[PDB]
Amino acid sequence: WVQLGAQKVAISEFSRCLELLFRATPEEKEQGAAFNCEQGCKSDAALQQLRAAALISRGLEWVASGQDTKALQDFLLSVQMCPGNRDTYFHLLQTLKRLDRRDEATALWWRLEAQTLWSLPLYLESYLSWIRPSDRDAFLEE
Amino acid sequence: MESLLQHLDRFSELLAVSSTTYVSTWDPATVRRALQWARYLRHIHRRFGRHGPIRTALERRLHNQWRQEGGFGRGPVPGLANFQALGHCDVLLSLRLLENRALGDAARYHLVQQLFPGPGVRDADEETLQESLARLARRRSAVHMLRFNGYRENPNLQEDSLMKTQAELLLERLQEVGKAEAERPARFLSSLWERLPQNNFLKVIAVALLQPPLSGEGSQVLVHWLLGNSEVFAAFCRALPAGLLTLVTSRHPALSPVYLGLLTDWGQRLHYDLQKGIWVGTESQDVPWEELHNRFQSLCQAPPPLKDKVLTALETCKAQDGDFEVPGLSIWTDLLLALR
Numbered sequence: 224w225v226q227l228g229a230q231k232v233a234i235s236e237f238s239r240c241l242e243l244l245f246r247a248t249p250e251e252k253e254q255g256a257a258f259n260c261e262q263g264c265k266s267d268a269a270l271q272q273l274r275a276a277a278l279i280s281r282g283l284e285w286v287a288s289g290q291d292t293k294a295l296q297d298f299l300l301s302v303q304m305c306p307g308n309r310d311t312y313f314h315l316l317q318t319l320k321r322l323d324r325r326d327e328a329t330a331l332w333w334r335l336e337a338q339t340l341w342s343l344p345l346y347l348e349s350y351l352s353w354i355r356p357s358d359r360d361a362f363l364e365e
Numbered sequence: 366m367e368s369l370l371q372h373l374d375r376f377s378e379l380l381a382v383s384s385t386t387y388v389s390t391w392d393p394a395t396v397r398r399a400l401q402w403a404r405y406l407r408h409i410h411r412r413f414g415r416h417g418p419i420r421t422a423l424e425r426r427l428h429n430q431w432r433q434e435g436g437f438g439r440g441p442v443p444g445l446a447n448f449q450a451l452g453h454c455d456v457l458l459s460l461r462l463l464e465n466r467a468l469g470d471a472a473r474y475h476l477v478q479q480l481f482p483g484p485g486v487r488d489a490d491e492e493t494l495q496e497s498l499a500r501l502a503r504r505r506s507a508v509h510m511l512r513f514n515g516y517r518e519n520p521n522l523q524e525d526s527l528m529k530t531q532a533e534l535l536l537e538r539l540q541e542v543g544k545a546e547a548e549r550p551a552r553f554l555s556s557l558w559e560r561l562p563q564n565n566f567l568k569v570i571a572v573a574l575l576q577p578p579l580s581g582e583g584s585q586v587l588v589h590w591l592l593g594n595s596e597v598f599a600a601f602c603r604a605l606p607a608g609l610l611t612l613v614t615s616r617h618p619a620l621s622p623v624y625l626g627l628l629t630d631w632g633q634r635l636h637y638d639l640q641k642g643i644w645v646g647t648e649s650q651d652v653p654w655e656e657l658h659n660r661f662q663s664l665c666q667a668p669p670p671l672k673d674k675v676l677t678a679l680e681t682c683k684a685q686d687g688d689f690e691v692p693g694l695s696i697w698t699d700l701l702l703a704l705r
């Protein structure tokens with residue numbers, strides 16, 4: 224729907240993706256009830272990297288409808304979710320550099336420099352690779 | 366009519382000093398004179414109390430006395446309350462004299478000997494003073510017993526027994542000031558608000574509004590006082606249960622669209638958090654989700670005159686904040702999902 228350009232029904236499906244991450248758990252092998260995804264669809268890494276992504280995909284719709292407080296809240300959540308994606312910090316810092324840079328931005332700079340792939344599946348890494356912006360480290364050395 | 370004024374104001378002076386602790390000068394003469402005057406008031410009350418210009422004239426003198434004293438700054442004297450308090454004025458005075466500790470021994474002796482000779486006058490024509498203090502001590506005890514072995518703090522406060530009572534006292538007291546026309550009832554209600562325990566007070570009013578008429582000029586005064594002052598009405602809608610305010614609405618629809626306005630203002634002070642499946646307040650004093658769900662559930666569980674109003678007031682509020690049809694987004698989506 225974002226490629227067909229329709230903010231509403233995008234922010235629908237991102238929000239419904241975030242409800243079936245958070246009012247449900249995928250790690251319920253109390254009943255091995257069938258044949259089931261060993262590897263791809265149970266990794267804590269695959270879960271925190273679906274979450275960061277959904278909040279990014281939705282926080283940029285919030286920038287496009289012009290509600291940049293909502294956007295900030297979902298971006299701030301995604302850094303709380305997955306501190307080793309860096310796309311999250313880029314989107315959050317772009318929002319802060321627009322509005323209220325100085326102390327907030329620097330506080331996250333020092334965190335990135337404090338910080339410094341395991342088994343995420345393909346469809347998902349290719350999706351992350353897809354959205355990520357080229358001009359990312361360029362922004363992080365400013 | 367004119368003869369009664371100098372009698373009654375002199376008795377009122379003597380009543381107000383009954384409470385007061387100067388009692389050294391008093392003697393059997395003073396006591397006897399007091400109770401003779403009190404007999405005459407009780408006499409008047411019987412003779413030409415009913416359906417007279419005299420009654421209404423004494424009520425003007427009552428309320429004029431009771432507003433020029435006011436009950437602010439100098440001395441908050443209760444006084445002889447109203448027209449039926451003339452029928453047992455004697456008792457009030459005698460009770461106040463017992464409560465004065467500095468009441469002189471000889472006066473108290475003459476007093477108690479005159480109130481309670483004993484059973485020598487078990488034959489008395491007029492339902493006498495002795496019998497009045499007995500049937501009081503009885504009622505009193507009866508109350509106390511019934512409170513501690515019988516009394517229940519009803520959950521439909523519109524059917525409570527103390528509330529129902531305190532309510533009807535305030536309504537009498539507004540009816541009097543209404544016919545006096547001295548100061549506006551607004552001033553009286555404002556002085557209430559200032560002075561007394563507020564929490565208790567408000568439940569009173571709430572019950573007041575649903576009491577059927579007795580002579581609803583009172584009810585029509587309370588709606589206008591409240592709507593005049595939005596700040597107290599904010600704590601009204603805050604401080605009660607849902608059912609009480611639902612019935613306030615179905616009865617007096619001049620309140621409905623201001624209270625819907627309040628919720629409309631409190632919901633819009635919420636945010637979803639994705640970790641915990643809930644709206645919550647920033648600040649401590651902001652209605653939690655469950656409180657607001659209750660109150661709306663109530664407005665809905667109501668007559669059709671209100672139900673369509675509140676349903677449409679939400680749907681228009683939903684469209685205003687994006688007509689999404691999933692939660693996370695619009696508080697009002699949430700409510701409307703929750704109510705099916």
Ligand SMILES: [Zn+2]
Pocket residue numbers: 260263264
């Ligand atoms: Zn799988």
